[PDB]
Ligand binder design. Structure first.
Ligand SMILES: *[C@@H]1O[C@H](CO[C@@H]2O[C@@H](C)[C@@H](O)[C@@H](O)[C@@H]2O)[C@@H](O[C@@H]2O[C@H](CO)[C@@H](O[C@@H]3O[C@H](CO[C@H]4O[C@H](CO)[C@@H](O)[C@H](O)[C@@H]4O[C@@H]4O[C@H](CO)[C@@H](O[C@@H]5O[C@H](CO)[C@H](O)[C@H](O)[C@H]5O)[C@H](O)[C@H]4NC(C)=O)[C@@H](O)[C@H](O[C@H]4O[C@H](CO)[C@@H](O)[C@H](O)[C@@H]4O)[C@@H]3O)[C@H](O)[C@H]2NC(C)=O)[C@H](O)[C@H]1NC(C)=O
Ligand SMILES: *[C@@H]1O[C@H](CO[C@@H]2O[C@@H](C)[C@@H](O)[C@@H](O)[C@@H]2O)[C@@H](O[C@@H]2O[C@H](CO)[C@@H](O[C@@H]3O[C@H](CO[C@H]4O[C@H](CO)[C@@H](O)[C@H](O)[C@@H]4O[C@@H]4O[C@H](CO)[C@@H](O[C@@H]5O[C@H](CO)[C@H](O)[C@H](O)[C@H]5O)[C@H](O)[C@H]4NC(C)=O)[C@@H](O)[C@H](O[C@H]4O[C@H](CO)[C@@H](O)[C@H](O)[C@@H]4O)[C@@H]3O)[C@H](O)[C@H]2NC(C)=O)[C@H](O)[C@H]1NC(C)=O
Lengths: 13, 208, 207
């Protein structure tokens, strides 16, 4: 999965 | 004589794959007579060649500021590789070396807890929403607040405090009009730190 | 030549009638060939002569550390009196003067709120008890914890953070065995600040 911050991609495993 | 200062990437940049972390070797007091500066860079003692010099800047005090910038990879940094800037210059008996890296030590995950205002705060015009972030290592972090997709900028955050178990805590306090709190509005604590899953977690907070 | 550093009294010392607060003028880098330091002190430009000199201390890096300590009255300090240490040494062209005083500006009463542990924390061995101290000016303060009249020592307190209304705030955190909190014990946050009534308040927290 992936995390986003204010619609900007953070990181994905 | 000319002096060297070496600065880490922003945590956020090392932590957001969509950003570009860079380390920065700043050289001050560069004479008008001998302005030419030579950077060699090493990563764990191995030389690298993709650094780039920023435009020369003349200062108020008659000297140049010369700056070289190394792009680095998210995971090298987070894996703790050591970055060495070596600076040479005619006005210098000997090259100045400086080294930096992430703080050494096993990373630990922050515990992120959101906390309603005190009952006693409820008289006042404005209330404090608290974000407690406890037990992270190392101290590299970013904390931000939002509501319905939009940033809430009226917060303040403590610097990291070292604890007796060797990890750090801090707290972030967002200040809202009481009526906004009373109105059912959901607020959120964004914490970015290397040892979190996907470098990110979020905790929410509303009137119950 | 020598360098000078003048230090404030401890916040707690200015705020407790029993304690004696003081202003400390420290001289470092004092040479072996010229140990003799001359101290003059002034309170609002008015010389005073009651300072006491600490025993001279060998540092082992070629120099001496010399310390003059000036006792002050609580009210003199809290009322904002200005303290000036002037230091003369034969290795100086001219005396070095340094000044300090309480921060200036309207003192503001702090707001002390105790915050219980989060439901998410309740799964853990230990829980966190929080005391948010806010709305205070100036930043000079001290915070403590206790349970049934006994001091509770497992806490940390952040430094004062400057807030957007021009006052300061901090959080302090006491970590306790979850059993103790489940079991109904009362835990207390102690704040000393000049703009509190009796320069002391205490707020308590229990499940
Ligand atoms: C002639 O003048 C120059 C410049 O003077 C400037 O202009 C006038 C108006 C003056 O009033 C000065 O105040 C101005 O600075 C003098 O240059 C100064 O010399 C100082 C030492 O000689 C040096 O001090 C060292 O500062 C370090 C912190 O520097 C930070 O922050 C200051 C402000 O606090 C800022 O001015 C600096 O430029 C620097 O800012 C950081 O820059 C880095 C690198 O770019 C940033 O990191 C990058 O950022 C990008 C984003 O763009 C991206 O995120 C990258 O990934 C990332 O790498 C970083 O974000 C910036 N931070 C901030 C807050 O801005 C101290 O840490 C250091 O202290 C250490 O060493 C000391 C002993 O030397 C110890 O006491 C101490 O414990 C520490 O170990 C130094 O104090 C000044 O920085 C320097 N100023 C500049 C602008 O270069 C020059 O000395 C003078 N000549 C003579 C002969 O007098
Ligand atoms: C030879 O050695 C000496 C001594 O150093 C020791 O021995 C050497 C050999 C090494 O082992 C060292 O590691 C040892 O420390 C060297 O002297 C040093 O010089 C430095 C600069 O020249 C100087 O730096 C300045 O430090 C200030 C902070 O000083 C504080 O905190 C430090 C610890 O962080 C501590 O070392 C100091 O003693 C001092 O501590 C406070 O003392 C006061 C007064 O005693 C206390 O307050 C009083 O005391 C009681 C409480 O018990 C009571 O409540 C009273 O009412 C109260 O008034 C106070 O509580 C103590 N606080 C703490 C936290 O402990 C900085 O502020 C200062 O910065 C400022 O200046 C800079 C430039 O202008 C700026 O960058 C900066 O922003 C500021 O404006 C300086 O950094 C060191 O203090 C000093 N060390 C000592 C021990 O004196 C000497 O340099 C060396 N000689 C040579 C030739 O190399």
């Amino acid at each position: 999965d992936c995390a986003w911050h204010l619609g900007e991609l953070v990181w994905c495993t | 004589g000319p002096s060297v200062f070496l600065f880490p990437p922003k945590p956020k940049d090392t932590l957001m794959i969509s950003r570009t972390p860079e380390v920065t070797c700043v050289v001050v007091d560069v004479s008008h007579e001998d302005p030419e500066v030579k950077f060699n860079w090493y990563v764990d003692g191995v030389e690298v060649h993709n650094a780039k010099t920023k435009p020369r800047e003349e200062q108020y005090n008659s000297t140049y500021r010369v700056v070289s910038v190394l792009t680095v990879l998210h995971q090298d940094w987070l894996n703790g590789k050591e970055y060495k800037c070596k600076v040479s210059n005619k006005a210098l008996p000997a090259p100045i070396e400086k080294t930096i890296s992430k703080a050494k030590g096993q990373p630990r995950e922050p515990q992120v807890y959101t906390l309603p205002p005190s009952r006693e705060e409820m008289t006042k015009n404005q209330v404090s929403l608290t974000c407690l972030v406890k037990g992270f290592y190392p101290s590299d972090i970013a904390v931000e607040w939002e509501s319905n997709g939009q940033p809430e900028n009226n917060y303040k955050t403590t610097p990291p405090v070292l604890m007796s178990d060797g990890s750090f805590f801090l707290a972030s306090k967002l200040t809202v009009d009481k009526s906004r709190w009373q109105q059912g509005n959901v607020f959120s604590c964004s914490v970015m730190h290397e040892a979190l899953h996907n470098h990110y977690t979020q905790k929410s907070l509303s009137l119950s």
